[PDB]
CSV table of C-alpha atoms and ligand atoms in Angstrom, one decimal:
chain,number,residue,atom,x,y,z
A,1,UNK,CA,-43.7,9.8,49.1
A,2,UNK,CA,-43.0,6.8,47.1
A,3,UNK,CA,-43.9,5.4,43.7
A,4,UNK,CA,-44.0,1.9,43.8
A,5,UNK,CA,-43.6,-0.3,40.6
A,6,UNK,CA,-45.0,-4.0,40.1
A,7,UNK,CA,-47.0,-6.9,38.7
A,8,UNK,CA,-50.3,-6.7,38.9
A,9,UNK,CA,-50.5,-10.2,39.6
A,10,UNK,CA,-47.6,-12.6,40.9
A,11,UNK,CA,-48.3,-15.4,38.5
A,12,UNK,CA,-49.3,-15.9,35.2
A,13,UNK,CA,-50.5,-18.6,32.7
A,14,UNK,CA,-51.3,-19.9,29.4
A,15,UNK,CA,-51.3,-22.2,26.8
A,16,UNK,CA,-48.3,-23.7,24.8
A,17,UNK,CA,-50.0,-22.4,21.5
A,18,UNK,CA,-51.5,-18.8,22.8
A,19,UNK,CA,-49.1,-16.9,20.7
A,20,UNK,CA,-47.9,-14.4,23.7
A,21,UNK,CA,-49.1,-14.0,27.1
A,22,UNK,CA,-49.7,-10.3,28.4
A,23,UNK,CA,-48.3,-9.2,31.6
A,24,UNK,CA,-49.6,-5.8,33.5
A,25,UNK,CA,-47.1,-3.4,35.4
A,26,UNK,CA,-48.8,-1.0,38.0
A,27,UNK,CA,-47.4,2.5,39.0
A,28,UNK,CA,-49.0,3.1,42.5
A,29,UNK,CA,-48.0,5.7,45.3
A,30,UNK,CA,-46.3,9.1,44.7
A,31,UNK,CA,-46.4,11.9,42.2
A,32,UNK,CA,-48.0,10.2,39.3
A,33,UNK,CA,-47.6,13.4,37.2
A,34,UNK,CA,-43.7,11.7,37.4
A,35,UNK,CA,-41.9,9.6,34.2
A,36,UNK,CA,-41.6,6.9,35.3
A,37,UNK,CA,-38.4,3.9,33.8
A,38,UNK,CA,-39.3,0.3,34.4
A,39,UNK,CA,-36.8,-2.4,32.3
A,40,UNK,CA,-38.0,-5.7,31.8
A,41,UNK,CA,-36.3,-9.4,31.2
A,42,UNK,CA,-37.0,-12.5,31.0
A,43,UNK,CA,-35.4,-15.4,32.9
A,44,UNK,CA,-35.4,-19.1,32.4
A,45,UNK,CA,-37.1,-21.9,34.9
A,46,UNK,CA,-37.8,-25.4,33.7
A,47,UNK,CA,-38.8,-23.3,30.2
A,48,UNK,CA,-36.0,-22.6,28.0
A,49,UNK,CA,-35.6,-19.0,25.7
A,50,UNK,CA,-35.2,-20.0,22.1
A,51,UNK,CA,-37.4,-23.3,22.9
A,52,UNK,CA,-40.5,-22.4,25.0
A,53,UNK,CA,-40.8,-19.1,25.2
A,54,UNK,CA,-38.6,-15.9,23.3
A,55,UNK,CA,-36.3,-13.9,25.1
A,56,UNK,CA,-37.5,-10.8,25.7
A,57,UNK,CA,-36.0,-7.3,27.2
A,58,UNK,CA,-37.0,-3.8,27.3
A,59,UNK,CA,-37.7,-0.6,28.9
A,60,UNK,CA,-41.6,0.6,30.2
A,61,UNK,CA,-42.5,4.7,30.2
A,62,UNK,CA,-44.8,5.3,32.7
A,63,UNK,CA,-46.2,8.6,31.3
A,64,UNK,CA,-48.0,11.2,33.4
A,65,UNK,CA,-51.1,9.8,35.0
A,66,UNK,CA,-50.4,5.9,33.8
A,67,UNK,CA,-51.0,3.9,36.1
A,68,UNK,CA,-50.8,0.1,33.7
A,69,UNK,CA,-48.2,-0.8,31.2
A,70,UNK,CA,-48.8,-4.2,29.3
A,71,UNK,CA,-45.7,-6.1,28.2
A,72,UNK,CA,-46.3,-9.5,25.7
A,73,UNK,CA,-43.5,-12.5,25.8
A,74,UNK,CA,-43.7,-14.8,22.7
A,75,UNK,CA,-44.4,-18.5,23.4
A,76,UNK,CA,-43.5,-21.2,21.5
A,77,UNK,CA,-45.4,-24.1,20.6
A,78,UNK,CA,-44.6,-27.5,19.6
A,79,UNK,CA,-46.6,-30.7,19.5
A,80,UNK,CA,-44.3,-32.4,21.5
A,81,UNK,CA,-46.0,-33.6,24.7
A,82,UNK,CA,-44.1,-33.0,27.8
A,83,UNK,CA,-44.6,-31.2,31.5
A,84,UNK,CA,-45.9,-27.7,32.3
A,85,UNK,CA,-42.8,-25.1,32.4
A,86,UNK,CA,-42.2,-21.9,33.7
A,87,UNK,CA,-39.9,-19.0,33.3
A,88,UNK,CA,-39.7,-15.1,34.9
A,89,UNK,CA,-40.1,-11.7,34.0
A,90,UNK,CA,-38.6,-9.7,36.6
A,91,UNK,CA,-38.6,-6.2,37.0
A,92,UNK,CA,-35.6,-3.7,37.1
A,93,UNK,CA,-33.6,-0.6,37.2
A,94,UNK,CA,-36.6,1.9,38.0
A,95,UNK,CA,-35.9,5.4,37.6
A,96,UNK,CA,-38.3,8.9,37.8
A,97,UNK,CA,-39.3,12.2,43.5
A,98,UNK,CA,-38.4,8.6,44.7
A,99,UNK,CA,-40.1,5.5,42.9
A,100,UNK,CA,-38.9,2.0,43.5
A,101,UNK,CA,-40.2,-1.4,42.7
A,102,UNK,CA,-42.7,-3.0,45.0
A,103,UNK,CA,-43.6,-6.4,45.7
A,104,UNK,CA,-44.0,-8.5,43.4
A,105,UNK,CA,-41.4,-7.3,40.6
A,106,UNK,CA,-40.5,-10.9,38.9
A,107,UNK,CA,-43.5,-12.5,37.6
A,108,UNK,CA,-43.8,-16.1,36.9
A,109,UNK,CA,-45.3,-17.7,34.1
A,110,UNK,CA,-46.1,-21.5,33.6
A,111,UNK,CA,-46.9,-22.9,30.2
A,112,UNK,CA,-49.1,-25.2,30.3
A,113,UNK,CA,-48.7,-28.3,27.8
A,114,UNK,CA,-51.6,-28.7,24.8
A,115,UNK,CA,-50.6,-31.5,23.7
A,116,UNK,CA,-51.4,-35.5,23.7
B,1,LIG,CA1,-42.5,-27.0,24.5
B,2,LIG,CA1,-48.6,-28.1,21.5
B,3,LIG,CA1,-46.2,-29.7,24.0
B,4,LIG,CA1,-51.9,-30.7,31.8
């Protein structure tokens, strides 16, 4: 019996000035009464860290019973006007009973451009 870890949704989206965009990881199968280790990283697309969006990196507790961890990744906004960009967040090194990741376990997130 398998815990599976993953996005709760394969893509996500927002504007060049929202601050941060959220991003949900579910815990699903298994022994959720299990710890469960998740790390997280970024990755660049088109969008660049220390430009469009902030790296980010860390390490998700799933706690007994918790079945949604939210992780935020800073965007950065500019008034430049240019094409939508994307980067990842993929998902990593998962540790507990068996749990792996599932499907999908890198996100993508487009910016979309505010500007003009
Ligand atoms: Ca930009
Ligand atoms: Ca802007
Ligand atoms: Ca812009
Ligand atoms: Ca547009």
């Amino acid at each position: 019996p398998v815990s599976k870890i993953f996005f709760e949704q394969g893509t996500y989206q927002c504007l060049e000035n929202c601050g941060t965009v959220a991003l949900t990881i579910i815990r699903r199968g298994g022994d959720l009464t299990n710890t469960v280790f998740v790390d997280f990283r970024t990755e660049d697309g088109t969008a660049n860290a220390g430009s469009d969006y902030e790296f980010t990196e860390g390490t998700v507790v799933f706690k007994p019973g918790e079945t949604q961890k939210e992780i935020r990744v800073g965007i950065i906004d500019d008034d430049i006007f240019e094409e939508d960009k994307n980067f990842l967040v993929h998902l990593s090194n998962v540790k507990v009973a068996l749990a792996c990741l599932g499907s999908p376990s890198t996100a993508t997130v487009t910016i979309f451009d505010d500007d003009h």
